[PDB]
Ligand binder design. Structure first.
Ligand SMILES: Nc1ncnc2c1ncn2[C@@H]1O[C@H](COP(=O)(O)OP(=O)(O)OP(=O)(O)O)[C@@H](O)[C@H]1O
Ligand SMILES: Nc1ncnc2c1ncn2[C@@H]1O[C@H](COP(=O)(O)OP(=O)(O)OP(=O)(O)O)[C@@H](O)[C@H]1O
Ligand SMILES: Nc1ncnc2c1ncn2[C@@H]1O[C@H](COP(=O)(O)OP(=O)(O)OP(=O)(O)O)[C@@H](O)[C@H]1O
Ligand SMILES: Nc1ncnc2c1ncn2[C@@H]1O[C@H](COP(=O)(O)OP(=O)(O)OP(=O)(O)O)[C@@H](O)[C@H]1O
Ligand SMILES: Nc1ncnc2c1ncn2[C@@H]1O[C@H](COP(=O)(O)OP(=O)(O)OP(=O)(O)O)[C@@H](O)[C@H]1O
Ligand SMILES: Nc1ncnc2c1ncn2[C@@H]1O[C@H](COP(=O)(O)OP(=O)(O)OP(=O)(O)O)[C@@H](O)[C@H]1O
Ligand SMILES: [Mg+2]
Ligand SMILES: [Mg+2]
Ligand SMILES: [Mg+2]
Ligand SMILES: [Mg+2]
Lengths: 489, 439, 506, 49
């Protein structure tokens, strides 16, 4: 073999994209992380995916967890390990000590274990082997200096066999040493780090590939999620800038708005409805949703502000009946607090809900509600995730944002999302004669002509009614206009 | 000789500029860094470049990675070491232990290793040696004081042979000790630190020369990128302020704009199109791109906001046909998210895309898109890289920035790039009679 | 001098000011620092300067570097140690271990080293000793308690001999302990700390004198630079406020501006040109540089924004020919990125270029370009350096600053430099009838009267033309004024109908 | 006093002044002849003939 490094696909969702193909074949891959990061899972899912997708038998070496529990715990993700053992596709090599025993057994077992490991490889014709918690065997009476030789023996032997290995290491500090003894990092050909970062009393699971000897990869951390389908990574940097874009138009739910946008929203576009509290962003959202059900198309409303009941109330008061929308299976509501999870989880819940309802339109009520507490950089990453996903899925997306300050209108978005979105719908309060009047304005459309006027609009039982602009007024954007009055030419 | 210290060129892109000539001849250089920094490559690339560029034979001493893998991993960059081994230009000295190890090697083995090296040096008439992972050999049962003498023995003996060496050392912290035992720094004549700094969930690789005993060098960290062409360093502080300038004018695509600029943009100038969102910077950029193809000149549009298709849609709706420009091979669109890489990588992608297309014009849509999350200093440093490169490459550059606040701009670029910009085109909204008109 | 301890001059640029006279004679000074800080150089340059300037023989004790390398490495600074060794003025004491050595030696050798040094001192009649990397000798198997007794033995004996010694020690952390074993700091009479502080991916070298038993010294860190001339320190706090000041006036290149300054800029003064980008600060600088060469005086233009060629282009577009100025050897352009080095380095390059050209005028385009990324406190320190240096050298200096916000900027300078400068030139944009017109104003001048009017100015091929002020206007400084009209039709030049031509033939 | 928003109701859009006395809070009339009331320091009209 006088070619480059051939990789084996792990079929772990997102991992093969960061690893540019997957783990290098015939080499050892070190997966380190703190307690509860998902190290044991990553090893299990590695062998399972190789069996079910490629018929490549696997050997699982455990040093602490009993084989009974390993199968037991795996049933969470709905995969029977006991079946693959019966089929001889998987062999859980019990290397865990018994409650009784003796000491002064340093590298005595290590030599014996290699023969036990190589045994299962030749016999089961194994191509993949995952060794869980290799550290736990040195946790007898050893130093860094001693661990290095025992590890290099195992790694070198496994490379000779021609088997692709995954090794699990346990950590104490999230950003300290990659491995316990500060040695494992340099013994392994490849380094993978599982992190469970705290910050803000929340948790964010991240995966990083520190190195893969002989190849390239994506540098940096990438957020993943442990679900009922195992590890799920979102390479939000791997998503390419090649989204489909057409000139197909769609109604906004408001006919006058469709005229103001030069014929309606683009089907392949992202719409932003920004305004102060009480302006009526949720109204446009509701209106935008009904129009999808008028053409008998599916759409999803992601609410993070109001409950499921209160949404029905405010909508019915606007005439539109959301009760019928759910019965006809054309509209699906979710409703969940932003504090209920992390942005990595919400991004998945959205993506998951989309594939199970194949929407043609989507409306997330308040992005600003999701930016609550979360850093701007982590939030901006969430936007690109949802935006790009719906963009390449031909789904028209309407997003809601509440500007922190009303009147004066300093910048559309405080978190600066106005450069990511395609169409900007601006709502604002206008102080006219002691009254808080509203004003709608299509701030921009990348492909359409759109109206330039700042038109007022009232709200009633019928819904939004757009009226005339403030032609005879000055400083309208400021929120506190000034009628100059034409005296008179 | 009775003069200054002679250096040996490494031919590594950027390094020889930083080391002011290359690695000093007859001395060992310590290249330390955490896991995945590119030490092994730096050692390999040091020997390879010596053979291919100077016909200087090399000896590679490995202490952990098996010799088969060294050649195997090298194939990624597209260079066959096995041929160099067969030609006797390169000798891979396997010093790695056997899977059936034994005990006590800290006296006869150091002499043995030197003997094997010296024999290898004399046999192949070698001029360069790279010893990979010297830390691994002390990892048996040694202390800092014991490591100091073993290194001092290793360095000095090699110094007598007259061999210019590169030594690889591993760390634990990125900004902690330079080496593992906190001793290797003062034993070596020259120190080089490879850093893989995290920050913001991204990784930035930097190169620093701590000291070159007897000579000068560039001080500080310098960002490098490991690609399919090996380590590529960008000494952004080395490039000189000697950019070429002429009175030649070029069209903007907008005839009336060319009148507003006194006859059009200069060819050797940096144009800045700033304004709030919706003002129409992409429009001016597109119109700037089309005019390049109208005069049958090549140009590159670096887009980081809109997709390739949406760019086509909006352009065609503006009349101009981007599709025809791609067929005639005068216009090339890249399109990539800012979060797809780091600024050290984006700078390279730009530079790489330029040399493969030799453009006459260049437009990067939304610099503010790249300024997402990244610190101000790292962004300004990235600007200098792209700005200075296009100026010296005779390429007219139009850049785009979206001011965070509409109406009340108060500042061209709030990131303050305009100070390094020659021509500024400003766009803004103006409230006229209840209507949003541009200016 | 009013100090209890007699000191010995190191002749290192700046150190004798920080140590208030040099190193105390008969005592030991500990110079410690991390790797590559310049420890060995300081000890080498300490012996060299003693030989060249005072014919004081020196003994160099090396514990790791080979004697041939000491001589080899010193040639970089243009120092022929091989000659000095041959002349018996310098003796390199090799105490370095063996590539084929045993183990265990750090006790009787310490007593033997005493007998070696005392032999070298007596034979060579040495007055200066440098023991480089004394730490490496305890780097065999020793602890802090063992170090204290062995150092004290070495130091005390050297003090008895009457030798002024410099001891080099290595560190791990830049701001942590002073030395490795945390013991050397209290055994020595004097402690000098060399630092290679990182911060912002750049490297800034500082020298600090922690203590001098028996005397005073300049407290705190002071930036130094290693060049082809060795260590160069900038005691930016030792620079006294005693510069010469005259009433002499010089032209600014712009005649109308000279009127606005009551007779032109002062010779011994600092000029600050402020304004938003595009106003024309670079223009005034060019005119300030041309007028010096037009009167046959030398001047240097320090540019940090534009290239050397673009400066030539834009100047020629303003008429003035910079090419001829370089030919006549009256004008010198530097041009360098602020990111190309640190403030300590830039400050030296500027100081160096001045001494190599002896200008009568100096001009630094965009100080705000040097304030990029650098903390305000470090930038201010740089400004004081250049400003103070130019002031005591009778060099007229014109500085440029670009306000980050245009039209309505509430301050002259964001870094608050307006109190260090003597004369402030203000440029700004004025929104008049949908047009961006410029305006110039002499904000302050220390010794003169100067014009108080905010006159607008146009820029053409001929250069800057100063016209009249916006008398019939309010809120000028705001950038977008409000037109009130009490007159404007009032005289000046009435008489309607026919009062002009355009035109004929010539 | 001003009801800035109500999710399920119509609510007054007027910024009406309100007095406080021994009897409690009493809401009165709006500042119709005033601009920039939200600013805090409004500008009157003319109250001419
Ligand atoms: N069905 C599931 N849904 C969601 N999360 C799950 C599910 N099953 C397991 N997990 C998560 O996986 C984590 C455990 O992962 P696993 O035990 O495979 O690796 P690990 O915890 O890193 O190994 P170790 O226990 O040795 O540290 C638990 O903290 C749990 O939160
Ligand atoms: N039945 C109704 N009749 C008249 N106006 C109504 C009615 N219901 C709601 N409104 C108006 O709508 C405004 C609320 O807007 P909406 O409920 O569309 O969401 P929103 O204001 O964007 O949400 P939030 O302010 O909670 O972020 C209120 O200020 C109110 O004036
Ligand atoms: N073809 C390639 N393209 C891009 N990057 C590569 C390529 N090959 C290797 N790399 C990068 O180089 C890094 C490995 O560097 P190298 O193995 O030379 O030294 P090191 O990792 O510092 O040493 P060690 O592996 O002993 O810790 C990998 O993390 C990988 O990201
Ligand atoms: N077909 C069209 N007809 C009229 N106006 C258009 C058309 N397409 C786009 N526009 C105008 O151009 C503006 C968008 O400008 P452009 O597409 O050049 O990018 P930009 O606004 O500079 O950047 P960003 O896309 O980040 O907002 C919109 O506000 C819109 O008013
Ligand atoms: N001609 C020169 N110009 C600029 N810098 C130089 C020159 N010669 C040497 N240097 C600098 O001097 C530094 C080394 O200083 P020196 O060896 O004197 O002390 P040190 O490195 O602290 O000692 P040690 O190596 O024992 O720690 C190098 O980092 C190098 O950059
Ligand atoms: N040949 C010329 N004719 C007319 N006006 C000119 C000419 N050259 C420059 N200008 C005017 O001068 C202004 C630029 O000023 P200058 O370059 O002197 O300093 P500056 O703008 O402060 O520098 P910076 O570009 O760093 O802001 C431009 O706005 C331009 O209108
Ligand atoms: Mg709402
Ligand atoms: Mg657009
Ligand atoms: Mg655009
Ligand atoms: Mg300038």
């Amino acid at each position: 073999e006088h070619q480059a490094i051939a990789k084996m696909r792990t079929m772990i969702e997102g991992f093969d994209d960061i690893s540019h193909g997957g783990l290098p074949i015939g080499r050892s891959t070190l997966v380190s992380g703190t307690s509860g990061t998902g190290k044991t899972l990553f090893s299990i899912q590695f062998l399972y995916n190789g069996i079910i997708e490629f018929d490549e038998p696997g050997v699982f070496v455990t040093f602490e967890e009993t084989p009974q529990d390993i199968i037991k715990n795996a049933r969470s993700f709905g995969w029977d390990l006991a079946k693959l053992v019966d089929e001889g596709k998987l062999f859980i090599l019990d290397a865990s000590p018994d409650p009784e025993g003796q000491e002064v057994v340093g590298g005595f077992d290590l030599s014996a274990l290699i023969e036990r490991i190589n045994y299962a490889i030749q016999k089961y014709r194994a191509r993949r082997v995952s060794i869980d918690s290799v550290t736990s065997v040195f946790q007898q009476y050893d130093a860094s200096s001693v661990v290095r030789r025992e590890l290099f023996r195992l790694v070198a032997r496994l490379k000779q066999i021609g088997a692709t290995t995954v090794m699990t290491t346990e950590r104490i500090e999230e950003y300290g040493p990659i491995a316990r003894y500060g040695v494992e990092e340099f013994v392994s050909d490849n380094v993978v780090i599982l992190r469970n970062v705290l910050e803000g009393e929340r948790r964010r699971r991240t995966l990083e590939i520190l190195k893969l000897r002989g190849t390239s990869h994506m540098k940096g951390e990438y957020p993943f999620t442990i679900t009922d389908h195992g590890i799920n990574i979102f390479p939000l940097g791997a998503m390419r800038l090649t989204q489909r874009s057409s000139n197909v138009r769609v109604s906004s739910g408001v006919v006058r708005l469709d005229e103001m946008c030069g014929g309606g929203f683009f089907k392949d576009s992202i719409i932003l409805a920004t305004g102060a509290t009480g302006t009526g962003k949720t109204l446009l959202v509701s209106r935008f949703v009904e129009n999808a059900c008028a053409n008998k198309e599916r759409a999803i409303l992601f609410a993070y502000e109001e409950s499921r009941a209160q949404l029905l109330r405010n909508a019915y008061s606007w005439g539109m009946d959301f009760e019928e929308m759910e019965r006809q299976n054309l509209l699906k509501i979710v409703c969940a607090y932003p504090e209920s999870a992390g942005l990595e989880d919400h991004l998945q819940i959205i993506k998951s809900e989309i594939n199970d309802f194949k929407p043609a339109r989507i409306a997330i009520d308040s992005l600003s509600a999701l930016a609550r507490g979360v850093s701007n950089n982590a939030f901006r990453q969430f936007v690109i995730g949802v935006t790009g996903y719906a963009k390449q899925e031909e789904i028209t997306g309407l997003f809601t944002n509440t500007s922190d300050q009303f009147m004066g209108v300093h910048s559309i978005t405080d978190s600066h999302i106005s450069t990511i979105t395609d169409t900007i719908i601006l709502l604002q309060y206008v102080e006219i004669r002691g009254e808080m009047s509203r004003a709608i304005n299509v701030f921009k459309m990348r492909g359409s002509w759109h109206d330039k006027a700042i038109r007022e609009f009232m709200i009633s039982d019928k819904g939004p009614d757009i009226k005339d602009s403030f032609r005879n007024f000055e400083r309208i954007i400021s929120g506190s206009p000034t009628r100059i009055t034409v005296d008179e030419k």
